[PDB]
Design a binder for this molecule. Structure first.
Ligand SMILES: *[C@@H]1O[C@H](CO[C@@H]2O[C@@H](C)[C@@H](O)[C@@H](O)[C@@H]2O)[C@@H](O[C@@H]2O[C@H](CO)[C@@H](O)[C@H](O)[C@H]2NC(C)=O)[C@H](O)[C@H]1NC(C)=O
Ligand SMILES: *[C@@H]1O[C@H](CO[C@@H]2O[C@@H](C)[C@@H](O)[C@@H](O)[C@@H]2O)[C@@H](O[C@@H]2O[C@H](CO)[C@@H](O)[C@H](O)[C@H]2NC(C)=O)[C@H](O)[C@H]1NC(C)=O
Ligand SMILES: CN(C)CCNC(=O)c1cc2c(cnn2CC2CCCCC2)cc1Cc1ccc(F)cc1F
Ligand SMILES: *[C@@H]1O[C@H](CO[C@@H]2O[C@@H](C)[C@@H](O)[C@@H](O)[C@@H]2O)[C@@H](O)[C@H](O)[C@H]1NC(C)=O
Ligand SMILES: *[C@@H]1O[C@H](CO[C@@H]2O[C@@H](C)[C@@H](O)[C@@H](O)[C@@H]2O)[C@@H](O)[C@H](O)[C@H]1NC(C)=O
Ligand SMILES: *[C@@H]1O[C@H](CO)[C@@H](O)[C@H](O)[C@H]1NC(C)=O
Ligand SMILES: *[C@@H]1O[C@H](CO)[C@@H](O)[C@H](O)[C@H]1NC(C)=O
Length: 527
């Protein structure tokens, strides 16, 4: 029996057998007043103590959110949908400490992704019990608000200021500062890590001053704030807020009266109208996301980055080979998870209209120009592979590289990886490759479980990734010093070296997607 006393009360953990060892899990610790009733849309209010022993023995409610209904029954897409009840009462976090209780352990804090509209910390692929067991780090994850309930913004108006989901996270980071010492964790050695919108959330904590003192280092997996889907403009955020007010009858004229009106609508009514607040939509459409609120973010983050105004520390940043493929079966004509999705120039051109709806005819032509100079015109998958690369280079790879370039320029160590291993278990078709989101199980040491059908080569690759991530977290340097591993160079805006992760040879390469990213980063922004 194990009971930790937090500043707000006592909490009872539970015991987990992992790899002939024992990990203690604390699942579902409240970290704020439930944002219910008059607290909907407002910032997370601090929590009143409890006298009891909170039985943090089961994952808490996931936050309200629309569910991806594109592949019922299919574990490839369903493994990402929430696996506890949805509920506005969802501000909870989890703690995996190694047993025997550590003394002064590095803390890893996981922020999930999901387009800022979806996600939950209780996913099987976010299970921190492995990392605690193998590397004796403490893993913490939290649920934060998503969609309108977590990112609605009427600027200046505390009734709905924006970035509430980000403030949810930041209140969790602070819970860890005030409480993790009781769990055997060193609040002075905290590494934020996250994926996709999680990764972009991590970058926004580097920029936000109120986060400066809540963490030590940062890890950005397939995502950063300068990604085109990541920050909403103050204009759009109001249009999207008001358009939502029409669709729900809640359109008033006193702004606060509008918010008053939405607080009395049902979570399902708000959930069901979010989709239409944009006039056109793409599969990469963050309807309600981060904005420049003058509280969490003081200015347009693209400026803060450019002018060095961020927490000075080490970052580890990477992306997956085929970031873009998953999105093609959510709309692109001629694509399917269930055939080889060979497509034509005309199908290719039509999918550009799908993925860049507001872009001029010449913008769409320029994308076709820079991705169809076929080295070999014979290949039939030319246009299929091109579109995946379009979406992946524009939405994920290039913004990650540009962020690492820019952030390293102010003198901090940065390490870049390129994950190129396709899971031996992966349930999606082969034309999709190394998909967005499918390094996460390797980062969390799930292949370390030999009773899971992963190959032995995958066991090692996970084992090495878990070592590298932990060393980065403890000592700001992501090396695997013992097993004669390939050393991981720092990323310098000059030479731009990165590490490839794979089951065969881990190599050191240079200037990833240089041709493609000069286009996306210098030309295309101007069209
Ligand atoms: C700001 O919002 C208006 C309104 O959008 C319409 O109403 C919403 C509730 C939602 O259902 C949208 O799809 C609606 O279109 C936008 O103006 C609309 O623009 C679209 C573009 O296709 C047009 O078809 C509609 O008829 C327009 N309706 C009105 C009332 O103007 C406007 O474009 C939005 N601004 C931005 C920057 O997105
Ligand atoms: C690949 O499949 C797509 C998707 O269509 C569905 O999936 C198939 C596996 C099969 O069950 C189809 O009958 C399904 O409808 C096909 O795209 C369709 O293509 C036809 C003709 O090309 C067109 O009328 C439809 O509008 C398309 N629908 C969608 C949703 O894209 C595509 O033709 C298949 N291509 C190859 C090369 O196999
Ligand atoms: C990385 N994790 C975050 C993976 C989780 N799902 C997605 O990221 C995703 C979601 C998508 C789309 C297009 N529309 N929606 C709708 C969402 C958002 C709003 C309400 C309905 C649900 C595309 C993708 C990309 C995607 C899908 C499956 C997958 F295996 C890996 C992936 F990369
Ligand atoms: C919280 O849990 C208390 C003790 O839990 C029970 O006993 C221990 C030894 C374990 O076996 C555990 O799995 C058992 O459930 C309960 O006595 C107490 O009522 C619980 N409080 C709640 C659920 O509010
Ligand atoms: C815990 O340790 C604190 C300082 O050490 C920290 O850990 C190492 C790994 C580095 O990241 C370093 O920067 C950190 O400062 C002490 O101040 C603290 O009192 C220690 N507490 C206990 C209970 O051991
Ligand atoms: C809007 O309504 C609120 C709630 O009564 C009120 O306090 C606020 O001052 C109003 N503002 C205007 C401009 O009418
Ligand atoms: C190093 O190699 C041994 C086998 O010689 C393996 O059991 C161990 O876990 C490895 N550690 C890593 C890759 O971090």
């Amino acid at each position: 029996d194990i009971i930790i006393a937090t500043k707000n009360g006592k909490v009872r953990g539970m015991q987990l057998t992992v790899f002939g060892g024992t990990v203690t899990a604390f699942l579902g610790i409240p970290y704020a007043q439930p944002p219910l009733g008059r607290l909907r849309f407002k910032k997370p209010q601090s929590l009143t103590k409890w006298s009891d022993i909170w039985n943090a023995t089961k994952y808490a409610n996931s936050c309200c959110q629309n569910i991806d209904q594109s592949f019922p029954g299919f574990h490839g897409s369903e493994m990402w949908n929430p696996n506890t009840d949805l509920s506005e009462d969802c501000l909870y976090l989890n703690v995996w400490i190694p047993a025997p209780k550590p003394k002064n352990a590095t803390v890893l804090i996981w922020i999930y992704g999901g387009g800022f509209q979806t996600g939950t910390s209780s996913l099987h692929v976010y299970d921190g019990k492995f990392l605690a067991r193998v590397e004796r780090v403490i893993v913490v994850s939290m649920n934060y608000r998503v969609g309108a309930l977590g990112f609605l913004a009427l600027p200046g108006n505390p009734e709905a200021p924006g970035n509430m989901g980000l403030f949810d996270q930041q209140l969790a980071l602070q819970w860890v500062q005030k409480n993790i010492a009781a769990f055997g964790g060193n609040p002075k050695s905290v590494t934020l890590f996250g994926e996709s919108a999680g990764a972009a959330s991590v970058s926004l904590h580097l920029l936000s001053p109120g986060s400066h003192s809540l963490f030590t280092r940062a890890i950005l997996q397939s995502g950063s704030f300068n990604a085109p889907w990541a920050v909403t403009s103050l204009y759009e955020a109001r249009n999207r807020t008001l358009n939502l007010a029409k669709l729900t009858g809640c359109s008033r004229e006193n702004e606060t009266e509008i918010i008053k009106c939405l607080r009395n609508k049902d979570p399902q009514e708000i959930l069901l109208n979010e989709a239409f607040v944009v006039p056109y939509g793409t599969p990469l459409s963050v309807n309600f996301g981060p904005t420049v609120d003058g509280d969490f973010l003081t200015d347009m983050p693209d400026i803060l980055l450019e002018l060095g105004q961020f927490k000075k520390t080490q970052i580890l940043v990477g992306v997956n080979k085929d970031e873009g493929t998953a999105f093609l079966v959510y709309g692109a004509p001629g694509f399917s998870k269930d055939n080889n999705s060979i497509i034509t120039r005309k199908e290719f051109q039509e999918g550009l209209k799908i993925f860049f709806p507001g872009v001029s005819e010449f913008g769409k032509e320029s994308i076709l120009f820079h991705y169809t100079d076929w080295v070999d015109d014979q290949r039939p998958e030319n246009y299929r592979e091109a579109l995946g690369d379009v979406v992946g280079d524009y939405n994920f790879i290039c913004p990650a590289l540009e962020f690492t370039k820019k952030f390293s320029e102010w003198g901090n160590n940065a390490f870049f990886y390129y994950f190129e291993h396709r899971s031996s278990k992966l349930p999606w078709p082969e034309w999709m490759g190394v998909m967005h989101g499918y390094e996460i199980e390797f980062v969390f040491g799930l292949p370390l479980e030999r009773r899971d059908q992963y190959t032995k080569a995958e066991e090692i690759l996970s084992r090495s990734i878990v070592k590298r991530w932990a060393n980065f977290a403890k000592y700001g340097n992501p090396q695997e010093t013992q097993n004669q591993s390939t050393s991981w160079p720092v990323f310098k805006s000059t030479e731009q070296k990165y590490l490839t992760l794979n089951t065969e040879s881990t190599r050191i390469m240079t200037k990833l997607r240089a041709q493609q990213c000069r286009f996306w980063t210098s030309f295309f922004p101007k069209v």
